Design an enzyme around this catalytic site. Structure first.
Site, PDB file in Angstrom:
ATOM      1  N   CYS A 220      38.821  10.090 -16.680  1.00 57.04           N
ATOM      2  CA  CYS A 220      37.494  10.320 -17.277  1.00 57.04           C
ATOM      3  C   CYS A 220      36.334   9.875 -16.393  1.00 57.04           C
ATOM      4  CB  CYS A 220      37.383   9.632 -18.641  1.00 57.04           C
ATOM      5  SG  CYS A 220      37.216   7.830 -18.571  1.00 57.04           S
TER       6      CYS A 220
ATOM      7  N   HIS B  24      36.088   4.758 -21.757  1.00 54.71           N
ATOM      8  CA  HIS B  24      35.987   6.212 -21.674  1.00 54.71           C
ATOM      9  C   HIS B  24      34.549   6.676 -21.483  1.00 54.71           C
ATOM     10  CE1 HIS B  24      37.819  10.201 -22.120  1.00 54.71           C
ATOM     11  NE2 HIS B  24      36.752  10.541 -22.820  1.00 54.71           N
TER      12      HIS B  24
END
Lengths: 147, 147
Positions: A28, A89
């Site tokens: 990510c 994330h």
């Protein structure tokens, strides 16, 4: 639309590999690094956890994910991000329909699997779980990208 | 010892995805408005039917459930579930009769595979399959099974 320069940057940064070995779609933080490098938008260095720390210092943050979609539709790079215990994330926020009338559409790779990945087909509320999705921070870049 | 449960559409109950064996039936509902064939279930509850006693319970809170990350125990007493959020992942085992959590384990950053043999956990991968990992670690599923 006006936000096209960002969606293009996303679609192209997908099969790229910012970190030598690991593909962006399985990382990510690496995917956000590739999108921002295409657009020429300075990014804090390190993993997703370090990046969110970095954004919280310089980048201004928006009140809601609904407001994130507004900036995104205006051609502004918008990063949704939440610190993890070890694996944080980060996602690119794009314009479009809000899931559950609240959560903005997104592009993000994820080490969790294809489930955690989104090529614009899942909102941040379908990537982060019920608990997490309401603790997200939305950061926007000061200057425009597609003006 | 866990065996994989396939989760498929349930005709008669619109937007319901589930599967069953001799002992247990597991069920999710699809609240994603765009995809009629999801890969994940962000929104609880999860329904567990104990087919031996004929009772049901509900898992009321939980991370994003992976469709096809669902496993049933041989004795039918436990249900193993892959649950992610953002870039985090975890394997949770639930009591098929009470829906109580019986074991949790962080799996973040690892690629994974389970079967009757046990749990395999790999780092430094180059594909979705755990066999793509340069490092592979076996872990016992006995604390998930409790037999």
């Amino acid at each position: 639309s006006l936000d096209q320069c960002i969606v293009n940057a996303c679609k192209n940064s997908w099969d790229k590999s910012y970190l030598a070995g690991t593909p962006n779609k399985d990382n990510c933080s690496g995917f956000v690094q590739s999108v921002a490098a295409e657009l020429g938008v300075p990014m804090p260095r390190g993993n997703a956890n370090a990046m969110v720390d970095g954004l919280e210092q310089s980048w201004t943050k928006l009140a809601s994910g609904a407001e994130a979609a507004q900036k995104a539709a205006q051609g502004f790079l918008v990063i949704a991000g939440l610190k993890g215990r070890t694996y944080g994330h980060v996602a690119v926020v794009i314009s479009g329909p809000l899931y559950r009338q609240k959560y903005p559409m997104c592009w993000c790779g994820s080490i969790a699997g294809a489930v955690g990945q989104s090529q614009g087909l899942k909102s941040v509320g379908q990537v982060w779980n019920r608990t997490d999705r309401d603790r997200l921070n939305y950061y926007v870049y000061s200057l425009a990208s597609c003006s | 010892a866990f065996t994989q449960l396939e989760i498929v559409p349930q005709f008669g109950s619109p937007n319901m995805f589930g599967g069953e064996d001799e002992h247990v039936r597991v069920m999710f509902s699809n609240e994603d408005p765009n995809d009629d064939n999801p890969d994940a279930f962000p929104e609880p509850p999860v329904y567990l039917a104990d087919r031996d006693s004929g009772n049901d319970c509900r898992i009321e809170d939980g991370g994003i459930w992976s469709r096809g990350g669902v496993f049933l125990s041989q004795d039918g007493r436990r249900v193993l579930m892959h649950e992610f959020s953002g870039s985090s992942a975890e394997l949770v085992s639930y009591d098929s009769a009470t829906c109580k959590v019986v074991h949790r384990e962080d799996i973040s950053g690892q690629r994974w595979a389970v079967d009757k043999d046990g749990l395999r956990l790999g780092q430094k991968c180059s594909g979705e399959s755990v066999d793509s990992c340069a490092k592979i670690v076996k872990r016992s599923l006995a604390p998930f099974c409790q037999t």
